[PDB]
Amino acid sequence: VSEKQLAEVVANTITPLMKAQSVPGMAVAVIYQGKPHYYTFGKADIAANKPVTPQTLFELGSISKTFTGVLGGDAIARGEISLDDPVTRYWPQLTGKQWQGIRMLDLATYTAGGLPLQVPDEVTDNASLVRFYQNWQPQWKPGTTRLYANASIGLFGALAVKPSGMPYEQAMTTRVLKPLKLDHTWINVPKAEEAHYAWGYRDGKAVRVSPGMLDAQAYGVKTNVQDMANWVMANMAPENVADASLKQGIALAQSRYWRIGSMYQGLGWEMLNWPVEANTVVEGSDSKVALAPLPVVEVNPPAPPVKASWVHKTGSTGGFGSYVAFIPEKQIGIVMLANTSYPNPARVEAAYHILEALQ
Numbered sequence: 001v002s003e004k005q006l007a008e009v010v011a012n013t014i015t016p017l018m019k020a021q022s023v024p025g026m027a028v029a030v031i032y033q034g035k036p037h038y039y040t041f042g043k044a045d046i047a048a049n050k051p052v053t054p055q056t057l058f059e060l061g062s063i064s065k066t067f068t069g070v071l072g073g074d075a076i077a078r079g080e081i082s083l084d085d086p087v088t089r090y091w092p093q094l095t096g097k098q099w100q101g102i103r104m105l106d107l108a109t110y111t112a113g114g115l116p117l118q119v120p121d122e123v124t125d126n127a128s129l130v131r132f133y134q135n136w137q138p139q140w141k142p143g144t145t146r147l148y149a150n151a152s153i154g155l156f157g158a159l160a161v162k163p164s165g166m167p168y169e170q171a172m173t174t175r176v177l178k179p180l181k182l183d184h185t186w187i188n189v190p191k192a193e194e195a196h197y198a199w200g201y202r203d204g205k206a207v208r209v210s211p212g213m214l215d216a217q218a219y220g221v222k223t224n225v226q227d228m229a230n231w232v233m234a235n236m237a238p239e240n241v242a243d244a245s246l247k248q249g250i251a252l253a254q255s256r257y258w259r260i261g262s263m264y265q266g267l268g269w270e271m272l273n274w275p276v277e278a279n280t281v282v283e284g285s286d287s288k289v290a291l292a293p294l295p296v297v298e299v300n301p302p303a304p305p306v307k308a309s310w311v312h313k314t315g316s317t318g319g320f321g322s323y324v325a326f327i328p329e330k331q332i333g334i335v336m337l338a339n340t341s342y343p344n345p346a347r348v349e350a351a352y353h354i355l356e357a358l359q
């Protein structure tokens with residue numbers, strides 16, 4: 001392995017990084033040789049002088065969508081839901097003619113026809129929620145245009161769990177977190193755990209995410225670098241997942257539904273074929289692309305996960321910035337949590353280099 005050389009590669013990547021982007025603290029895990037390697041830097045809480053630790057809770061931001069995808073995926077494999085089914089199958093009060101051709105897959109993979117990045121600030125409840133989607137007008141027709149959005153995968157998450165009869169948070173805990181024994185992963189941090197909760201920093205001001213409609217589904221999950229490492233591992237080598245529906249869930253989430261250039265969308269996760277040059281992934285991480293509606297090319301029928309992939313997901317909040325990546329065929333991976341939202345391509349800049357030192 002070369003643990004000495006390994007603590008060198010990470011320190012020599014992360015310290016300049018943290019200095020350059022003004023990051024108070026970071027928790028890193030590299031998985032290599034079937035093992036997670038934990039490395040910690042700086043401060044969780046600077047006014048309190050609390051050091052970062054492998055049980056420091058960071059807000060994952062958009063990386064919560066990977067959890068939303070496996071859940072949704074587990075419900076599929078359970079038979080409670082199907083991607084081809086019209087959305088209206090699970091929410092018949094969605095009465096617009098607009099909603100006609102949109103299947104569940106569309107919501108799941110951002111291709112309804114233009115659902116917006118975030119959910120409006122006025123949407124504060126289900127009524128307001130329904131008026132929103134009732135009176136939302138497309139732009140493009142179903143299955144024609146990828147536009148990353150919370151209002152899209154958020155609604156999939158919320159609809160996906162209805163047949164379970166469980167609220168979203170209990171379903172997530174029951175069908176996904178506990179089975180994988182992610183016992184320090186929360187949608188809501190218990191009072192008894194807040195001391196492990198890092199502070200975020202935005203403009204030299206400590207901040208923490210605020211509640212919003214559909215948050216848990218699209219950005220509101222919080223972890224430590226240990227549960228996150230085990231999460232990457234369960235998805236990386238799903239072969240030792242007991243529960244047959246969860247392993248299949250992981251599988252549907254890393255299936256390719258849509259080809260968008262060098263990238264292929266899954267449920268929450270995104271993929272590229274390996275090998276992939278650094279800058280194609282790095283520039284692909286730029287918001288110039290990331291948040292831009294691009295056309296799409298159906299993978300029909302959806303291909304099951306290909307080990308030969310760089311699968312990853314970026315995600316942030318006000319004061320937090322994280323990123324995770326893996327290469328199933330290489331059995332190598334990395335987690336980078338930080339309490340400062342710093343440039344996304346900086347993130348993949350670092351993770352790529354660290355990973356290539358292991359090849």
Ligand SMILES: *C(=O)C1=CNC(C(=O)O)=CS[C@@H]1c1cn(C)nn1
Binds near residue numbers: 209218219
């Ligand atoms: C997910 O990463 C996430 C990061 N901020 C963004 C974005 O598009 O990158 C808006 S969507 C999502 C988020 C974070 N918050 C607080 N709300 N949505």
